[PDB]
Amino acid sequence: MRECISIHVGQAGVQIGNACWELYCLEHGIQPDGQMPSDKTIGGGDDSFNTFFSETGAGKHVPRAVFVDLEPTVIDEVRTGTYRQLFHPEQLITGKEDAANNYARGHYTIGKEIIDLVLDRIRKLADQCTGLQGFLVFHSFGGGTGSGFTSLLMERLSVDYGKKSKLEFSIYPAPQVSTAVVEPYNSILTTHTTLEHSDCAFMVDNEAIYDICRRNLDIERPTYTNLNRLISQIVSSITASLRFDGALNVDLTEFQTNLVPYPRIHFPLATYAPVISAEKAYHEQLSVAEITNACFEPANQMVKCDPRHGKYMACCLLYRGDVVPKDVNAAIATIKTKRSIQFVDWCPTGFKVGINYQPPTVVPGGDLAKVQRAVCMLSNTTAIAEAWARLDHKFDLMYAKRAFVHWYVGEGMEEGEFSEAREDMAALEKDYEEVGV
Amino acid sequence: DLGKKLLEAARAGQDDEVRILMANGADVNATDASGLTPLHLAATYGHLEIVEVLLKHGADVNAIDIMGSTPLHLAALIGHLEIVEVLLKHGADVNAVDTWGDTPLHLAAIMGHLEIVEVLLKHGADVNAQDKFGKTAFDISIDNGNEDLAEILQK
Amino acid sequence: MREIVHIQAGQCGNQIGAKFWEVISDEHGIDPTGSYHGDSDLQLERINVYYNEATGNKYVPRAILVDLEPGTMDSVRSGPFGQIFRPDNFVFGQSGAGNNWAKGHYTEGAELVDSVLDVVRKESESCDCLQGFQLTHSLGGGTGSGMGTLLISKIREEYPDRIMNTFSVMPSPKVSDTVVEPYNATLSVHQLVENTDETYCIDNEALYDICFRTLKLTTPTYGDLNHLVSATMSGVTTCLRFPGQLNADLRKLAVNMVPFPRLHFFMPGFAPLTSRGSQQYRALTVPELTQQMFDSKNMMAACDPRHGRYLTVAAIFRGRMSMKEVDEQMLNVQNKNSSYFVEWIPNNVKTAVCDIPPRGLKMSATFIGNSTAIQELFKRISEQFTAMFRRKAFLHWYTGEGMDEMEFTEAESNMNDLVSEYQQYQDATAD
């Protein structure tokens, strides 16, 4: 099989991870203890979902997942929650002392004390694979562990597994739901040191997921759970092609081929539709054309930016549900015409289309209403450079006065790495500038 | 030499030594390196008895050390209320200025000796007197935000 | 980051520290014998932070009581919870410091300091993951000022990878016994700027003005002052002692509150302000709590926030209330006072909420501010230090104990520099 190993780093990664794996089990008919009745396989097999789930001799399906955190408070709830006996116990690694929202602690002082244990555990999962193809890393930009340790992990993984691919699911920080003033620092610091080692990174803007919950789901003050369940819906759409027999994005290397023209600008923009509140169970069922057009309304994006102010470089449409291809081609031709969405003059001006005829699954307990057809548009557009512009502005107001820098220098880090990371980020903004016009 | 014995006796409070050292003709107006007389030292260590004795035996109530400090400056600074009145009863210069431009009102204000501020005020303490920085006693009560002191300084 | 080791030095350190234990014990359900007689369960989820679980349900404060004057021994034990402290954690000398910082930092205090480190070690070796220390002391004395800073510096050498906290009480002529308190304070501030990560400035001039003017107490006693201190020390330690979503620790606070190493003197504030007895302050709305928190009348440091700029802020709401009505009112104050928050530290105001209200009240809000206006407290201490030092008054007490006159001037210049840095970032702009 072509296995994938999901890694979750920090509080955010872990909690988003637990929601994605909750959803996966339901999409595949796996009980919280791993036992699946409708699978003749009892030792492994070669189904489409074996890429994400191992299989013991007793018929238990164990995720190919590792959870890491420098504190235990979060991973301790995984060890006692509904999915106690789902994950590999040895694949739930924790420390005693966290990185205190500090990139240098998660990457240097504190991260060094646990890095070798996480690699050996990953190596354990890797050695149980017959054709590992890469990793799916889940982490936040803001935390000390999500930024520091994750960066440290992506460096070591490039040295050990050099041929394998690496995909990120990054949580772009938002002030409505934040936890530290130094998150701009940690964001710029990890992006610079990770941009070299990642093949494709899907940023999730907590402010965008926050807005969607308040207007499309009618939730006054959303919680991390509302966000995560909604995030897990988008992630599942991206990883579905890897878990079900499909024609579009069948393996990790194809994500790069279809979405990442140039290595450095590997940040595609995700858009998902429809998002309807569960309190509206008898809503009119939207058609392919209505949800295909919804993928271009900026109010449905996972990162806040204006794609109308940027050229497209790639665009993949991932439909899920009762979707007839003839209606998809028609809806694409409607978009290619009435819409003034400009593609770069050097890439194909077409849309790739995958269709998964399974109806979208909603977690029993969430706020999302069951729909019969939904779509997730992955698109690499230069308009996402605005997200780098907002972060770069914060990492500038503070660094101009060298605010909070002493906390990083005192944790085994050179002051020069701030100017390095920022110059590298500046270099990234020009890459998007030259690709556009 | 009895000059030193009277200076060190006044500082310590050795009342009996004062009555004796003076008996042998000790210079009541002796001075140390900095220019402090026995009355300066007595006024700085709350030795009221020695203050009154020295004043009834020729002490210069307005004597000044190298820094221009009169006995009242030190009494106002350290905050010995009784001595501030005795000194004033014997003609202490209530508006004496030292090398830093400070007056006894300035130092009593900075240290928060509100009782001595009221006493100095009723004895003619200049409220427009400025230090080398131009600050009056009232300026100090406003800069430091001493609501109690600012009220007393405007009566 | 779990356990914290508490230390208290001198009459003031043991008095406010003893009150701190009477307060959090009442909130966590502990009795003066150790038995947990509480009803809820959130009182134990983070009890390891300050208490040690021995015997059965017998909890014991992870506290260390130090004082050069033995008269403080029987005093603390005579108090309500005086029997809960570990009796071996009492490290008291025979001769007091007599308000002589030098005695506490160089002579008598140095004889006793190593006896205290041995107690600290035993307490620290019994920790799963120690996160730091916290001290309670006064800056105007000899024991808490001199032996405190000496003990702080000695602990920095031995536990350099840990957070150092202090609840430093500032002297004031309004609540004062000697004019040498600026000497002792200035010499102590010189040590606190180099050897502590966070300091809660509890100014006695502010505590007096609140009692004398706001609470209208004709003659405030220490008990009236300490009622404000314990209330402030209970709010600032809320998130350390109850999980919430933030799971805060001393290090997360320092990283986010202290932009620059030397500027780590926080200006705490409380609301509602009540004396020991009043029951009319049991209906304060959320908008009143919010406004009343940034109000200069509610600061525990005699300083006007409007005369400076906030570097960082950390509001803590307590009680059953609307986490939304808070989030909207906190965003309001950040606009009407928009010019009082530095524009070069984005999103420098964090709001937390804990449902457990303090004893006596149903809703409360605690303020922790890193305001550049705190220079006012230091210029006041400095102006008094200068006035005495320019007359070289009472220097022989200190020099006689070995100290050098060059050491006073070094402490003076350091505070003048500390006021300069505050003025820099108070006038700095983003441009």
Ligand SMILES: Nc1nc2c(ncn2[C@@H]2O[C@H](COP(=O)(O)OP(=O)(O)OP(=O)(O)O)[C@@H](O)[C@H]2O)c(=O)[nH]1
């Ligand atoms: N969407 C989403 N974001 C989260 C979640 N939990 C934390 N975050 C975000 O993560 C950022 C802070 O990083 P964390 O992951 O919480 O911290 P950490 O990775 O554990 O690293 P440490 O600070 O050392 O503990 C903040 O901007 C939060 O908004 C979550 O459950 N869902």
Ligand SMILES: Nc1nc2c(ncn2[C@@H]2O[C@H](COP(=O)(O)OP(=O)(O)O)[C@@H](O)[C@H]2O)c(=O)[nH]1
């Ligand atoms: N709030 C408060 N302040 C105190 C208390 N005791 C002393 N102080 C202050 O602390 C300073 C004297 O320090 P002190 O603790 O007595 O010296 P030490 O005991 O020798 O370390 C003075 O400015 C007092 O106002 C107290 O119980 N409460």
Ligand SMILES: COc1cc(CCc2nc3ccc(C)cc3s2)cc(OC)c1OC
């Ligand atoms: C020890 O007491 C506390 C510690 C924290 C630590 C966590 C922090 N996170 C941020 C993020 C941004 C900013 C500007 C400041 C901070 S302080 C928070 C508290 O109340 C909210 C506390 O009060 C009880």
Ligand SMILES: [Mg+2]
């Ligand atoms: Mg965390």
Ligand SMILES: [Mg+2]
């Ligand atoms: Mg964490």
